[PDB]
Swiss-Prot record, chains A, B:
InterPro entries: ConA-like_dom_sf, Galectin-like, Galectin_CRD. The modification N6-succinyllysine is found at residue 106. GO terms for biological process: apoptotic process; cell-cell adhesion; myoblast differentiation; negative regulation of T-helper 17 cell lineage commitment; plasma cell differentiation; positive regulation of apoptotic process; positive regulation of canonical NF-kappaB signal transduction; positive regulation of inflammatory response. It comes from the Eukaryota. The gene is LGALS1. Transmembrane segments: none annotated. This is Galectin-1.
Amino acid sequence: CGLVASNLNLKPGECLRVRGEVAPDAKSFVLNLGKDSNNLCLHFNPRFNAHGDANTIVCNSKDGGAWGTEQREAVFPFQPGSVAEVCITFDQANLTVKLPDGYEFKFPNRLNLEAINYMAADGDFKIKCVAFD
Amino acid sequence: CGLVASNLNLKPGECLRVRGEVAPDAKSFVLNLGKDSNNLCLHFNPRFNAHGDANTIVCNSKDGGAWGTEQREAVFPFQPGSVAEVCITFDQANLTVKLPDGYEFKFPNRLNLEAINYMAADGDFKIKCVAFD
Ligand SMILES: CO[C@@H]1O[C@H](CO)[C@@H](O)[C@H](O[C@@H]2O[C@H](CO)[C@H](O)[C@H](OS(=O)(=O)O)[C@H]2O)[C@H]1NC(C)=O
C-alpha cells in the first residue's frame, strides 16, 4: 500500500513532520498513527469526496482493532494536486495536528499510549520526507 | 530492531536521503535496504568499534536469508558525536552510496530488485529525517 514506518519511538511533546504530495484527482488520503495497525491513537483522514463526505476532515481512533467515534472538523485546508506538510504532537489529553498555514486540529487522546511507534499513509498521499524533531 | 520502513517503492534513479545523529560513543550502526529482512540488496554497516573492526564500512547483500560476499570500504567519513547524511540510489547494475563529505562508492546489485520497498535502521544512529527524492 502506502508508506509504513515502525519503531518511531515518538515521545509526548515531540514533533512528527510529514511532507507529501496530494494526487490531482484525489478522493481521500489518510495518515494513521499509534502503536500498530490495530491500535491507532490518530486516524487522520481528509475526504475530498469519499464515503459520502465532501471536503471534510474525518478523525477517528482504533483500539484493539475496533474503530472509535468519528470526529469531524469544519475547515478543509487541503487541495488536490498539491504538497501538504503536517506536524503532529500529543499530550496526555490531546493529539495535535498543525499545518504551516496556521491551521491547528486537535483530537482526544483515547488510547493514552506512552509513545507513537507506528505511521502509515493508506491514501492518495505520496510521502516525500519524514522528520522526527 | 530500530526504525523500520515498508512500501518505500523506490525506483531506479530515485534518491533515498537519511539524515541522523551518530552517537558520541557509537560502536556501529546499520542501514538495511531491499525487499524484506531476508532479502537485502544493501547491508550498510559502518563499524566504529564492532566485531574487531575499527573505522571500516562493511557492505554486503542478503538473498533468501543468505549473506553474500562481504565487501569493505577503505575510507571512513563518519565521526561519533556528529550528524551524517547518506544518499542512496541504484540501477540494475549498482547501488550508489553517497557519504557526508563528497565520498561516493558503488556496490553491485546482486538481487536485481525492481524497487526498494524495505528500509531498516539499527545501531547507534538516531534517524532525524528520511526523504524520497
Ligand atoms: C456506517 O459506516 C461508516 O459511516 C461513516 C460515516 O460516513 C464512514 O466514515 C465510515 O467510513 C470509514 O471510516 C473509517 C474511519 O472511521 C475509515 O476512514 C474507513 O476507511 S479505510 O480505513 O477503510 O480506508 C472508512 O471506510 C463508514 N464505514 C465504516 C466501516 O465505518
